[PDB]
Scaffold this active site. Structure first.
Site, PDB file in Angstrom:
ATOM      1  N   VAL A 139      26.788  -9.365  36.201  1.00  0.00           N
ATOM      2  CA  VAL A 139      27.989  -8.545  36.235  1.00  0.00           C
ATOM      3  C   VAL A 139      28.268  -8.104  34.800  1.00  0.00           C
ATOM      4  O   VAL A 139      28.563  -8.937  33.941  1.00  0.00           O
ATOM      5  CB  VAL A 139      29.181  -9.351  36.776  1.00  0.00           C
ATOM      6  CG1 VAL A 139      30.475  -8.540  36.709  1.00  0.00           C
ATOM      7  CG2 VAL A 139      28.894  -9.818  38.184  1.00  0.00           C
ATOM      8  N   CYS A 140      28.041  -6.837  34.524  1.00  0.00           N
ATOM      9  CA  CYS A 140      28.587  -6.359  33.244  1.00  0.00           C
ATOM     10  C   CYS A 140      30.094  -6.695  32.771  1.00  0.00           C
ATOM     11  O   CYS A 140      31.204  -6.750  33.397  1.00  0.00           O
ATOM     12  CB  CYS A 140      28.462  -4.849  33.226  1.00  0.00           C
ATOM     13  SG  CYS A 140      26.772  -4.335  33.461  1.00  0.00           S
ATOM     14  N   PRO A 141      30.105  -7.010  31.490  1.00  0.00           N
ATOM     15  CA  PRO A 141      31.473  -7.378  31.053  1.00  0.00           C
ATOM     16  C   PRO A 141      32.365  -6.189  30.692  1.00  0.00           C
ATOM     17  O   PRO A 141      32.964  -6.158  29.628  1.00  0.00           O
ATOM     18  CB  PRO A 141      31.197  -8.301  29.845  1.00  0.00           C
ATOM     19  CG  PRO A 141      29.957  -7.742  29.249  1.00  0.00           C
ATOM     20  CD  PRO A 141      29.136  -7.155  30.377  1.00  0.00           C
TER      21      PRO A 141
END
Lengths: 177, 179, 169, 162, 171, 168, 171, 172, 167, 171
Positions: free
Chosen positions: B48-50
């Site tokens: 999951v990209c931050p």
């Protein structure tokens, strides 16, 4: 003791006032496998603060129907107080003939089970989204007459309903902000 | 048992500061002085990209202008937090963010704020604590769906103005009175 | 154990006064100063006609002549009490009553007086507390039957008469 | 907590019937048949006049008409009750009353109805139990003020006229 | 465990005195001063004639000569005791007896003396308490058989003699 | 809560019979058959009151005429009871009494009848049990004042008369 | 846990002395003064010949030479012990023995020394207590089999020898 | 908590060193209906107290076998220490090649159940005679090392065995 | 929860010293003064050759250099320990070792250190306690495997280096 | 009580395999098939160089010869393990190790093996489990002192020889 977010939503059975101003009962189990549930809590009826949340939400009832969402309002007041609040016109401090259902948490049991009861008295302003499998996906709890746009609520449901199918979506240009 | 509208549960944690040094942060340093926006996320280094952390970091001046201290929190160690900052965005990292990340290595903060899932990782949550130490707003998401920073700043502004949030009140609505 | 002939359970509650302002009523504010007729009823805005409240307010000066503070009480919020006063009698309202209505929002007064039903609402009841805080009379009704305000007055006069002269016919 | 609106606590007692005969009475004999007006009073033979027991006895046909069994109850023995009925009113007695007096010799009825004062005698009280054994009305008094027979009959009629 | 040969359980009761007045009698008022003959009977106003209470009241001076206080006791109230005294013997009463009647309305005395039957009424019984407050004799009857005053006075005399001149009986 | 007017506590004791033999006696033997006059005394071989036991045995025919079984009881062993019967009267013995003496060696009988003093010996007591096993009379004396057989037989006669004709 | 090698349980008892007089014996009167051979036996007046008690009393001067108090003990009363001494050997008695017999009427001594059988009588036992009050030797017998007085004396001698010289061999 | 004298002897199961020096196991139930058991306890092996009693009992093993009694020794030491003490000569304070079994009460549970454990450490010196029905007839407990002649033990066994068959007898 | 990185459990035992006298040792006498190497072994007189105790005794000067007190411990009595010292190396004994042997006769030291097996004997273990009374190293073996004395000395030096400088 | 010499505490963990894929490792999957060398270490990305993890992987074929599965464990998540594998040795990483790393994210495995320190992280520890699931060896270190892979292999060899032959007398 731990949160019910991401777990099965606490069961409730409650007396209710329907759109047609008749009385009945609503239990959470009747929506499992059929509808999503947006259960919202608010402190009290007949207050000096405008019930703009209840009125705006009912204006958007077709947006909730589109999304297969049962909108349920809930306070610790009796079904007779809710009915009277509906039979009171807006200019005399009422909410009018709203078409969605209002639940009576007369024993305060629902507010206790959902962790939204303040001082063993009244519920806080809160929104709980329950999916079709009966799992809680989103919880918002506010203390100060905050207050939430109907546009934000519809966007959250959309984001959740899309997430159930497609999972996590990495936004385009996320590195900017 | 809800802490919303009541005093915020005490927290003490080792943290990674904007300058990449380690130190300690506790709730009492803010009481009677600053508003605190404590956010929670599950883990560092996932697929999951931050995006939320970066969006929050870009708005750090907006937070400071309104006297709020922004604190990020996960169940990871301070060493993992530092390693995530040292990994660039391009390689699935956070980069040199300016706000502070707390390490909830014992899981106590997550347990006390009621956001710990399956005795392992916290959920995605936001807690706004006022300058008297009272929790005014709580948001808990089970999914990585995101939250607008403009909406966060709109909530903060409503609380700091003692003004109402949401839709416009209908013109015809007037509080009731006697005959 | 009945509180009858014993000290009345203490209560503190938010209230709607006759002038429609909000405040707090404490049982200790009457000890050594006034008799208290604490009456209970289940709910506001019901389909049962509220003739008892109205009849009791019609007789408020009879209560004051006897040094009694009349306090009404239900589990509804003070806001619902005020709204019920602002509703016309035609629409089942109570009108602008001059006596005080207490809000038992936590349900603890109804519990302490042993009148809470099904952890929801109170039963209809009347409690007469003397000037030393002792309960001299208790009446509890499970049905919407009403009570003559003349009987309440006769009871008050009788207890006040016996407190001064004892019991000999 | 309260028995008002719930099932009345079971009772079984020795009794002095109107004809001075001795027998036994229990709550279950009235269930599905008669309404029950159970009243309590502290003691027999005191210096407080028994006007209420006399007023209630005058109204016995009114009670019978409404299918009501009138039951008086004290902590005294059945032998004291009969002795009080054999004492004339002028001599501080009750005379030949036609309704039944129950003997709460163990003080259990007074305890079960929450009307026992100290661990001695009961308070002045009235308990109206319906034909399903449910308590519909409770009145408790600390003093000898008395209750209007007309109010009692008016309560009975509100319960009987739904 | 029994209280016989040990200190007598304490009591305080409302009483009806010989002059028909109301008062109170407690056990410690006699300690070091008089012996106490406490007697129990089930009820006032029963169909069993009160020949024992009347026999005992006629012997009151015999008891006073021996420095013993005769106390009668039942679970009935002081009002019933007075009412029973105001009732003539021909109508089943006890008349104006000179000795005191205690009211054990709470039942605690009968419970402490181990004479309470079915949590209702006392059994017929006699208890002799000495001047040190020690119980020397207990008699408990279930039926209405009575007890001669000559036997009661003989026991009291034998107890008073044994207390000071040795505890040996005769052949 | 006393046992007077209720069923008498059960006992099953070792005993010394009239013929000087050993055996057992239990309460259940007498139900619907005999009245029982159970008496307690503290100790054998004291010079305080062996005369009461001797006098009671002299009245055995009077006891049998009313259909009553006379049973004596103390915390002494059966061997001590037998030895006491074998001791001459002039040396403090009781002689060859025909009634039965129960041995309450465990002290459970005196405890159940509420006559045991200081967890040592029983007080001087009399317990009359009817044919339905109910205790109708109880007497307990802390002192050695004794009790006439005439007084005992009066009580029995009065109890048996009351059981036949009620209270008159 | 046993009391052997530890302080002997305290006892205070009514006693029949060698001169047929009554009195009291407590354990602490011997502490620092003398050794105590305490023996238990079930009952007086049984059909088991009292050979052990008679044997023990014949060697009383041998017990005095070693500074030991011989104490007999049963659950019987002191009145029964005195009567057993006043009965001749021919009729199943013990005669005028010179040593003290203790009465364990409450049964508490037999309970404290763990020799009571079926809440009734003691088992046959021997307990040797030091001048410091410590139990050095315990012997318990379920049967009426007797014990040699020579063996008892040889054991006392060994304990007294050990206390002066410590451990030495053989035998 | 009364005594086991005149009652069932508490059950025991222990690792043992047999007369042949092999290791094994013994339990009380293997003797019931078959033999009398003379179970003796002593504190420890290799003490400064010489083991004269263990030597004396082993020379009389035939007298014990003649009257159907199994002689069992018991201490809180391991089976290895028992064997090392049998392997120590008598001149160095050992017990030598004794023919009767020595049980190891390594958990201290046998001593505890028999009420002979001292300060949760070692047992006192004791003798327990268990009949063929598993009933304890005799218990001797000594605090000091004072010995017990085998003639005395054999006199007691004979007296118990005689009483069990023929009942009470008065001496001459 | 383990005691490693925390205060070592207190112990007191009767002991057999190098001179063959019986005495006593407790943990408190070493705190602030020396490091302790407490080692456990199940039993004296077994068929497992006591080469570990003998090898540890030959290195006694190496332990003394590093300010460490070597202490052996088993559930056997002080009399068994002495008898085993009095047993020649060639008969399976340990001879006249110079270091102290503790007797855990009640088995409480083995219980407190969590090395007791089936309420009977200790397992084979090694516990290093620093001068602050803190446990820095623990080794527990179920089998008669052995531990080189050089591995033990390397561990003590590494712990002492970390205390002076760090990682 | 310790688990050494007894059955090893059961564990089911999420894992990062040699090929950088995720999975699950269970203890029961090795019973009757392999020996297991389970090792614990505090954390990934620390300022203590991971020379131990590196040395153990460089010696992986030595563990395959002895039929031992090498498993590394930390309280870190499976994502931190992968990120640490994807970090070069020069920047403080471990590189693409071939052995499996387990994630004890709940801290339950460290608690069950008694190597958790102050409810946060594990201590440095090594556990050798039998082919029958019995723990034969346990080593716990409070400090970052390391342990040569030669000592580790010598112990495994010694444990495996003891299973066939007994103890070896000389050393």
């Amino acid at each position: 003791s731990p949160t019910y977010v991401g777990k099965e939503a606490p069961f409730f059975k409650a007396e209710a006032v329907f759109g047609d101003n008749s009385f009945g009962e609503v239990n959470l189990t009747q929506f499992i496998g059929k509808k999503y549930v947006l259960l919202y809590f608010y402190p009290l009826d007949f207050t000096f603060v405008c019930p703009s949340e209840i009125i705006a939400l009912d204006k958007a009832l077709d947006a909730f129907h589109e999304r297969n969402v049962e909108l349920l309002g809930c306070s610790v007041d009796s079904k007779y107080t809710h009915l009277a609040w509906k039979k009171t016109p807006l200019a005399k401090g009422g909410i009018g003939n709203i078409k969605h259902t209002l639940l009576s948490d007369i024993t305060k049991s629902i507010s206790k089970d959902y962790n939204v009861l303040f001082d063993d008295s009244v519920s806080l302003r809160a929104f709980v989204l329950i999916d079709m499998n009966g799992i809680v996906q989103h919880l918002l709890v506010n203390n100060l007459a905050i207050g939430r746009s109907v546009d934000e609520i519809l966007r959250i449901i959309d984001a959740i309903q899309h997430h159930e199918k497609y999972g996590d979506v990495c936004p385009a240009n996320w590195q900017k902000g």
